[PDB]
Amino acid sequence: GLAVFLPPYPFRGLKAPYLWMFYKYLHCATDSILFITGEDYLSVTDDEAQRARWEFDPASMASLGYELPNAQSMACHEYLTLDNAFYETLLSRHHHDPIKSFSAFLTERIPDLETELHALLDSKKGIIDQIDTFISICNCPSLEHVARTLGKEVMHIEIGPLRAPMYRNTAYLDFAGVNGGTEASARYEKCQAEFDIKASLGDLHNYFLEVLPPAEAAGVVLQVEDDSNLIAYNHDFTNISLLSYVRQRYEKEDILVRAHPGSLFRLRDDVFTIDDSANSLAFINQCNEVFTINSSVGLEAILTGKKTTVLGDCSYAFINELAGASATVNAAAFYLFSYLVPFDLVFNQEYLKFRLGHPEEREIVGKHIEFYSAAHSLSSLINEAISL
Template sequence: MIAAFLSPYAFRGVSAPYLWVFYKLLSSIDEPMAFLLSADYLEPCDSAALKGRMELRQHRQIEHGYGLPDAATLERHRFSLLDPELMMRLLPRFGGNPLAFFKAFLSEDIPEIRQALETALSSLPDDIEVILSWSNCPSLSAVAAARGIPVAHLEVGPLREPQYRPTAYFDFSGVNGNTEAARRYETDPSVWMQEFDVPELRRAFSSMEYKERGPGNRLGVVLQVEDDSNLISFSNGFDNASLIAKALLESSTELPLIRSHPGSRFQVRQGVAEHDSSATVLDFLTQCKKVVCVNSSVGLEALMLGLEVDVEGDASYGFVVREKDPQQRARKLAYFLLGYLVPYSLVFSADYIRFRLGKPAEAEIAAMHLRGHGLEQDTDSAKVDIREALRHMARLRIESARVDAGAEEAGGSRDEWLLCYRARADDGYTDDLHIRPSSLVRDGAASVVRFVLPSGSRPEVVRISAPALAGCNTLRAMRWGWGGDARAELLPLFDTHLRLISASCAHFHDGEAVSLLNDGGEVYFEFSVDDLWSSGTARAGPGHGILEFSLSHQSMGSAIALELYRIKEGILGQGRQVGEASMRDELHRDIDELSSRLQHRSSEIALTRAELLESIHDQSVRLNDLSALVEKMGRSFEPLAEVQANQADRLADMAARIDGGVALLLEAQGLLKKELGDQAEALGRANASIDEMKRVSEMTWRQKYLAKRTKGRQA
């Protein structure tokens, strides 16, 4: 049985979010598994605890190739739950610093964690073949070693779609640090004793045609995410600040070019260094003659472009960087790309995992990876010519690109990018104008398009027209700027979906991204931008307005799946909102009615009581009608069992709320009855007082009458 360890601290913000890995394993490995994890991973997908998680969104499922698990899927597997609060109990030992705890988790055998893992593992079956882990954890390694169970460390690789053939890490020693990459190469370097060409290696693994460009002249600095394990435990003492400081010392005559990580929480202040705003990593690298990093995939891309690279951390490809002989470096790079990195399609396969558990020779691993990249190879790995196979991979990429280009040429130009706008003038607005992009960068399936407006133009509305491609066309980001040339620094807009005025067809937004479903006709987005030109930057002086758009495209199949998901979510959301609003309104009306009735005087008590009884009767009639409606709906929707169940739940909730309203009315009736009794009692007391007053008055009158008669007699 294959087991997997998923950090229980992922939901506490101290390690990577592995929820998608859990769902991917459930979808990809078609056999019962064992899991060591926290109860967070087992929350129902519609629970409040997982609300807002990216892993639940349809486009993320399509991107990574998994589905959301149901109860039947979970029942096939074994789970041993770890206590996520153990970290909170251990934090005082690390001064309350979560990152200090994370560093120890990654690099030390912590007795309390080892004991928790030992207890959890004891509750699982004894036939565990391997434990898959997505982070280094010496405590786990110690427990597994004592039981003779290997630990395989997995992670998404440095080469990813759409720019490259997608890869993954599979390492029995570690990931992001303490890896076996260099050791495996030294164990059997004879497999790679051929003449490899670095540009050919790049073409074999690249998903797009690369046009050779002249070398840049900048020192590029690539930063990491601040709480990444690369910095926390495997950076050899470097962090982002010390990396920049070293670059400033090395590049004393010119400021280094800094490229921040997309997931970073911080930005480099202008003046300290020059911030790179290139649309793609390739654009950044073409400006550089050298790149320095701690442990970044950008460093590997720089190696594939033949740039000089300094890696300060414990990078898995560090042994390639440190090799000074060009021929040996090409051999080590070939091994790293084909022998060490795993095709992404294989790493979640039980067959591949067991293949690696068999300790195959390096030649067998290379042959397996070639098959994973789509090359049919001779079953005898000894006959595989790795250099020729890599050349074949490169040729396949080139031929595929030529076929696509031929089809595009036959169907006409697909790069019909255009920006239409109306410019402000002293006497109103000019006629509609249009310009073509000043730069167009294709990054696999995505495009970044930049338009430079004529000097002084301040349009109120702009419309970007994209190539007519059938499927889902998504505008993921929009940036703007004002400057003297097209290379001005651009600022991101975080209200793109609010600026959208119209679109060529049905659209929806997911956060800032706006998507269109298109059948191959015109594709355009229209935005309001008049407020941008009133900023201090645009008012400061003459210049050009600059607008940049990042767009991507999905096939029609993916687009339809995404749209169906959005429609379903929209209907359910609207149903919940309508149902809740209806019940709230109904309760508010009942409460208002009760309040107005309770304000009447005692003279209106009888009338109020009659109205309440009538209202209760009306509620009962409505409840009977509602029950009849539920019964009728049940008969009408018998084939739709799931829909019927959902409707029944909602109607039951509504009936419960109505019962609550009836209870309130009955309670009010009781209060009114009590008040009526009190009033009747008070009225009785008043009548008695009046009778007493009449009696006293009558006695007084009789006394006066008798006194008068007596006086008369005396006279």
């Protein structure tokens, strides 16, 4: 059985922040799941005051592919609820800075949290013995240590870098960590010689493109300031120091900035030239090279053959650090077909069992292409796919 970890701690000012994953696993569940979560996740569906949350938007339910759970759907699983008081305690140990508290939660072992997790799991020890793996939407060394004591692994699972409408929907699945401390590079290193791809980057990019590619400066990508990427996995770089970094190398009218609509702040009116392109691709094509901390837009540039500079930690960084025309295509082919997972599968318990048995990269790739579609060797599967 699965144990899904969905912490209630409002680090970013939002209750039940990972509610969409709760709804998604509930909608896709076939067997009982152990949810390690908070009481807010259990009351929010019936909370008449949180009716305007984006998770309840019909467009979001359709985009992420779930429906709202009824009583039977929610009640037929197992629950362990994390104590509401631990958040305030964590805050007090970091000068009540919610951001710095979030960072510690993502990158450090927290004894109090491990203790509570142990106590919760011990209350249903018979249930825990049946657990096949732990699942987390974010890194959490506390949870990861606790899982090791039980001889269990933690699958880190998150929305992927390529998404609709532009691309096929993808997801992250990482045994080491998602976004930060990813295992993507280590995975490719072990199975590199199995990848001999007969294609260009355009061929790897168009297969995932679902829309007619746009027609044919220094690009700077801004991101949301208070997410895990810029709080913990940024190598101390920020939106400000990123702009400062590029400024050390370029003049103002040679710089095109791509703002993120979800950011708390935006650049003042007449400081930089702001891009107003219909999409990421239309922005990238106006640039000679692209600068980013760890935006997924950076992946898109690399896939289109644009010179990209990555200042933060991310899953696709190892691809860019390769000098070679064919060495890059092979690395990207692995990332796209073997590392990235079709979005729906990471919520499919049968697929998760498959990944849990530690299958060969060939089996993983074949399973993904099988999903994408409507040959035996790994390279032949990919080559045949991006030609048809």
